Design a protein around this ligand. Sequence first.
Ligand SMILES: Cc1ncc(C[n+]2csc(CCO)c2C)c(N)n1
Ligand SMILES: Cc1ncc(C[n+]2csc(CCO)c2C)c(N)n1
Lengths: 317, 319
Amino acid sequence: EECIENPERIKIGTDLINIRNKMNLKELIHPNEDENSTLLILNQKIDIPRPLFYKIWKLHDLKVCADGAANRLYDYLDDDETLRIKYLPNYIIGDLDSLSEKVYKYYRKNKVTIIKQTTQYSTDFTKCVNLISLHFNSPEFRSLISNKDNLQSNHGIELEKGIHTLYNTMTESLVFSKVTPISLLALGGIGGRFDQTVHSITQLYTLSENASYFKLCYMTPTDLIFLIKKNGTLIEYDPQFRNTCIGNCGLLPIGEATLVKETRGLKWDVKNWPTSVVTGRVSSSNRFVGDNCCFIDTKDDIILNVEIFVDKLIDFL
Amino acid sequence: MSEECIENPERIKIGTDLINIRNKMNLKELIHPNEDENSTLLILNQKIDIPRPLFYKIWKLHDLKVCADGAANRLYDYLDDDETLRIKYLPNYIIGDLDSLSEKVYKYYRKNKVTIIKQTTQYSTDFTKCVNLISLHFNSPEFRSLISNKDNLQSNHGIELEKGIHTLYNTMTESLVFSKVTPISLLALGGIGGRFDQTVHSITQLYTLSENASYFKLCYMTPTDLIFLIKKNGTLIEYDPQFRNTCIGNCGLLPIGEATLVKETRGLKWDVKNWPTSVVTGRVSSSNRFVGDNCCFIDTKDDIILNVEIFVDKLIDFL
Ligand SMILES: Cc1ncc(C[n+]2csc(CCO)c2C)c(N)n1
Ligand SMILES: Cc1ncc(C[n+]2csc(CCO)c2C)c(N)n1
C-alpha cells in the first residue's frame, strides 16, 4: 500500500499498466456523432449559466423533464417568452401532482408529450430512464406515441406503471453491447433533497449493470459526476480544456468499499490502496496532474467527481 | 424470514411487541443539545443560507463554535449587514491552512481575539482538523492551558504548524477513557450540497466518528435535511406529533458506503422486513415518510445514514 505526491504536471507512462477502458471527459457533455443522446432535467431549480444551457440543449437530441422539472424549466426561462417557447422538452413524465396548472397548460398547449405514472414504487428518475430507453429502443413504443387517437388517453400507456411494464418487456431481449449507446446528461439530480442525491448515485451503478448502453453523467453547479469502470480506465482530456475548466477530483466508493489497485496522473497517486466511505479512506480534494490523461484502476466500479468551472465550459463545447 | 414491504395507512401506532430497542433518540435533540452534554456548532466552507432567526437560536443552543478555514469568510459575509450582530456571533476557533481566508476577514477575527490555528498538512481535511480540535478543546485540559497560558508566546499558539492538532489529538486519545468522556452534540452547517467529493467526505465523518470517537454525536443541517447516523440493531426515533407535522417531511434510509440488511422497520409509510439495501443494487428506501404517531423504529444489521426532510422556516418555534 502506497501514496505519493506528484509534481504539478507530468506525462504518465504506459509501461506496466493494462488500459482496458478509455473515456474522454468532453464526451460526457458533447455526445458522440452516432450514439443516441438525451438531456434529462430532474426536479430541482436550474441555475446552470444560460449560455451553457443553450449549448448542452443543442448537443443533445431528446429532452426529458421529470415531473416537477417542467416547472423548473418554465421558471428558468423567465426573461423572454420567445426563448421559453424555443426550448420545449420532448417528454414530461411523472405523477404530475407537482405541476402547476399554469405550467401543465403551457406545455400541453405547446404539444409536449405528457405521460402520467401514478406508481409510488419507482422514482421519477426511473420513470424517465425507462421512457428514454423505450423511445430509442422500442419501435412499438414509438408507434404508440406518434399515433393519433391516443394522446387523449395517456397515449395508450397504463396509468399506474405502464412505462415500467413496457420497459421490462422490452429489456428482456436486449443485449446491451449491441444496443446503440445513449449519452445521458442529467441536471438537478444532485444537491437537493439528500435521499434524492443518493438515489441519483444509485442510477450510475444500476444502469451500468442493468442497462449498460446508457452513459450517464450528472452536471451540477460544481461537478461532473459519473461512473468509472473497474480494471483500468484511462481518463482523457485536452490540456487546455483541463487547465481552464477543471479543478479538483475525487474517487468515491459510494455504497461499496473497494480497492484502488493503481492510479497514474493524480496529484496524489495510490497503489494497492483500500478505499471505503465507512473507514474514511477516500481520495477527496485530489486533482489531475497528467497533462492530457489520468489512469485509474480499481477492483470494482467507482464513482468519480470532477470539479468544473461552468462559466468557462462553453468555450470548449 | 421472507423479504417483505408493506404500505401503511398515513398514521399507525407501533408497539414493543417482541423487538429489541438498542437506542432511543428524539429528532429535536439533534438540534437542541441536552443540558448535561457538551455542544458545538461547526461551520464548514460553503455559503450559509440558513434563516437568520433559526441561526440565532442554534447558535445560542450550542456552546463552542468552530469555523473550518474558509468558513470564516462565509460567516463574515453571512452577517454583512449588522456589525452589532457580527460582533455578537464571533466563532471560538478558526482552523485550517488559512490560504482561502480573506485578508480582510483574517484581520477582523484576529483583532476580535478569535483563536486562529494554522495547519498546513494536505493529508487531512479541514473537517478532521476541526473535530480533532473540538475534542481537544473539551477533553484535554492541557490543550486549553496551551492556548490560554499567557507565558506562551510561541507562534500559532504553540501548535506545530504541519499536523500539531492531530499529533496532540492522537496523544490525548491514548489516555482517554471513552466510556467516561462527556458526549459532544455536534451540529454542522455547509458540509452537504457543494463540491461533491466534500459531500462524500462529510458522510464518512458520520461513520468514522461513530467508530473512532463515539462520544461525538454528529448531525448535518442543510436547507432541506437533517442527516445523521442510525446505529445498528434497533433504533427508536421519537418525535412530538405537532413538531413532526409542522417541521418534518419525508425521510430516507441510506446505506452509503456499505450495503446492509434492513431487518425491520415499524412506523414508516413503507415498512420493510428482511429487506436487503444497497446503493449498488439500487435497493434504497427513498421518499419514505414517518407514519408512526409519535415514533419510528428502524433495525438494521449495520449502521446506516438517515436523512429527515425538514421545513427550516418552521423549526424555530419548536427549538
Ligand atoms: C421500501 C420503500 N421505501 C420508500 C418507498 C416510496 N417511494 C419510492 S419511489 C417514490 C416516488 C418518488 O421517488 C416513493 C414515494 C417505497 N415505495 N418503498
Ligand atoms: C489519496 C489522497 N487523495 C487526496 C489527497 C489530498 N487532500 C486530502 S485532505 C486535503 C485538503 C482538503 O481537504 C487534500 C488536498 C491526499 N493527500 N491523498
